[PDB]
Design a binder for this molecule. Sequence first.
Ligand SMILES: Nc1nc2sc(C(=O)NC3CCN(C[C@@](O)(Cn4cncn4)c4ccc(F)cc4F)CC3)cc2n(-c2ccc3c(c2)N(c2ccccc2)CCO3)c1=O
Length: 215
Amino acid sequence: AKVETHEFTAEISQLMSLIINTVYSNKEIFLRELISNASDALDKIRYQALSDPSQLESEPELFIRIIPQKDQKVLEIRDSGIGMTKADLVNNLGTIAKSGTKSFMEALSAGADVSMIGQFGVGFYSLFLVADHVQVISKHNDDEQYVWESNAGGKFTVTLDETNERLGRGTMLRLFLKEDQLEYLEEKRIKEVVKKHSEFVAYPIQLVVTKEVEK
Ligand SMILES: Nc1nc2sc(C(=O)NC3CCN(C[C@@](O)(Cn4cncn4)c4ccc(F)cc4F)CC3)cc2n(-c2ccc3c(c2)N(c2ccccc2)CCO3)c1=O
């Protein structure tokens, strides 16, 4: 019931420093990668639910939700997919992620762009193009809610979630944007990116916008 600190394998840590310092334009592709991961997670609970339709009871709705938090300079990406267990918060960044990270690093050395990260299965880490820090909140039907946190360094933490909204089921990525990357808190900006790169998504992409009620 405490804060469990871990170290990244050199491969994961290696990719994060590259992306976070990268001065590459076209930073906007991070959102395509995260939406694709959200859709994959929803595919899995929808598939699991096809036989046992009661795995959906923890959150009956299947959605992708984007929440700008302007005062916090935070952007949240939430899904009601299958979710990740505490085991996964420390054992979903390995195996498929161990291979995909190391081979992607070698492709980058050969000349590959960060736009290709997704075809190596590690598109998650493209968030560091725009964020210098991230928390990942997740809730799997067969486990409690947990929080994963990293600031692109070799160390990340995992903590039982006693402070965030209850997800019901699924995952929410909390991106702490950089000061030069705050454009991605704006409704018009998010619409453009989603419509350009995420046209073929089987689930509703909901955008939560906060607006002052005018005179
Ligand atoms: N929004 C996101 N949502 C989802 S859901 C998800 C996922 O992989 N799997 C769930 C969990 C359980 N598994 C296995 C199984 O069923 C197998 N089993 C054992 N027994 C019987 N069956 C099972 C069941 C119950 C159980 F207790 C244990 C188990 F193993 C299948 C369904 C990944 C993501 N990612 C994501 C995508 C790509 C990524 C990452 C994150 N990275 C990441 C990872 C962690 C933290 C930070 C970043 C990094 C780079 O790449 C999202 O962004």
